[PDB]
Swiss-Prot record:
UniProt-recorded name of the protein: DNA double-strand break repair Rad50 ATPase
Comment field on protein domains: Binding of ATP induces a closed, compact conformation of the Rad50/Mre11 complex. ATP hydrolysis opens the complex.
PROSITE patterns: ZN_HOOK
Organism: Pyrococcus furiosus (strain ATCC 43587 / DSM 3638 / JCM 8422 / Vc1)
Xref: HAMAP family: RAD50
Disulphide connectivity of cysteines: none
Lineage summary: Archaea, Methanobacteriati, Methanobacteriota, Thermococci, Thermococcales
């Protein structure tokens, strides 16, 4: 999967924004409240509307002072270019239109009936929503979501790997993710933790950290460490699936991280994020600029986001 273009009109702080995304690490940098997460959440809305996420509401996200919201996304999947266009009219919903086209030769052609339901039906077959929310797009505040429970983790894993012996394949997959996560987390914590153990056990995927030679529960970690671990696991997952999904969208990776950890993050960008064909990384941390392949600066001007292509 590859994101080419996002166009947003009257979505939260964005009055009129166009962002071109490219291969490699695409860093979107800007201060608190400038419009970074609004762009990512516009991508989510663009792909999967109707959503049932409590903090994203049609009547809230229309930019104050405007009536019409417009989201347009161009992306590639499995060699085919796709375009989804959504127009929202606040307070109303019948006069609003949703279309999904594909590039067939030169002409763009509707892939289905231009309706939320049919598009959702197609999108779920193209890229399942759970894979997007759990494996592709890590929303702000959700870095540690994968540390939540053995069951939820089993659910995401099972969904992510899809369909001798299924169990052997599962063990091998989890083993590889565990290897990768261990390498990353050990780099992140300077050998404080020598392994991240990801283990299948009944309808559950256990997750432990090794400290002084023994497996420990996740409560063992400090807050910053849980951030590091979440990053490590999601990166391991993205790398394991690098050939299949090839995209990682990560909002603010720096919460609770001290100075050294923030420096290690750069090393991790350099060593690992560069192995994922496309990454969209959002942060207020300027230190992250040098390790990125493409930098987009966002700021708030007179009530509206302004986007500036740096590189
Ligand atoms: N409906 C709206 N109309 C105009 N501005 C909005 C609306 N909803 C939210 N905002 C503004 O959008 C700003 C950017 O939010 P966000 O993109 O979440 O910031 P960040 O760059 O920190 O992710 C907020 O600080 C808020 O003032
Ligand atoms: F306040 Be933002 F998410 F940088
Ligand atoms: Mg944000």
């Amino acid at each position: 999967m590859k994101l080419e273009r996002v166009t947003v009109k009257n979505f939260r702080s964005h009055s009129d924004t166009v962002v071109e995304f490219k291969e490699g690490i695409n860093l979107i940098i800007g201060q608190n409240g400038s419009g970074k997460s609004s762009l990512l959440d516009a991508i989510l809305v663009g792909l999967y509307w109707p959503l049932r996420i409590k903090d994203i509401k049609k009547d809230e996200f229309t930019k104050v002072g405007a009536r019409d919201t417009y989201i347009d996304l161009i992306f590639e999947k499995d060699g085919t270019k796709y375009r989804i266009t959504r127009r929202f009219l606040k307070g109303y919903s019948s006069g609003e239109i949703h279309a999904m086209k594909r590039l067939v030769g030169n002409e763009w052609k509707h892939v289905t009936e231009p309706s939320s339901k049919a598009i959702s039906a197609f999108m779920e077959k193209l890229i399942p929503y759970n894979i997007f929310l759990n494996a592709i797009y890590i929303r702000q505040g959700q870095i540690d979501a994968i540390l939540e429970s053995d069951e939820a983790r089993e659910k995401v894993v099972r969904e992510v790997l899809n369909l001798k012996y299924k169990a052997l394949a599962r063990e091998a997959a989890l083993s590889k993710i565990g290897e990768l996560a261990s390498e990353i987390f050990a780099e992140f914590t300077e050998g404080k933790y020598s392994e991240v153990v990801v283990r299948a056990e009944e309808n559950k995927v256990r997750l432990f950290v090794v400290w002084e030679g023994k497996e420990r529960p996740l409560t063992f970690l400090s807050g910053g460490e849980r951030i590091a671990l979440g990053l490590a696991f999601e990166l391991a997952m993205s790398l394991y699936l690098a050939g299949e999904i090839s995209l990682l969208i990560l909002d603010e990776p720096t919460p609770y991280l001290d100075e050294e950890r923030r420096r290690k993050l750069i090393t991790i960008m350099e060593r690992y994020l560069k192995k994922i064909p496309q990454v969209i990384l959002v942060s207020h941390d300027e230190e992250l600029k040098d390790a990125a392949d493409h930098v987009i600066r966002i700021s708030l001007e007179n009530g509206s986001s302004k986007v500036e292509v740096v590189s």
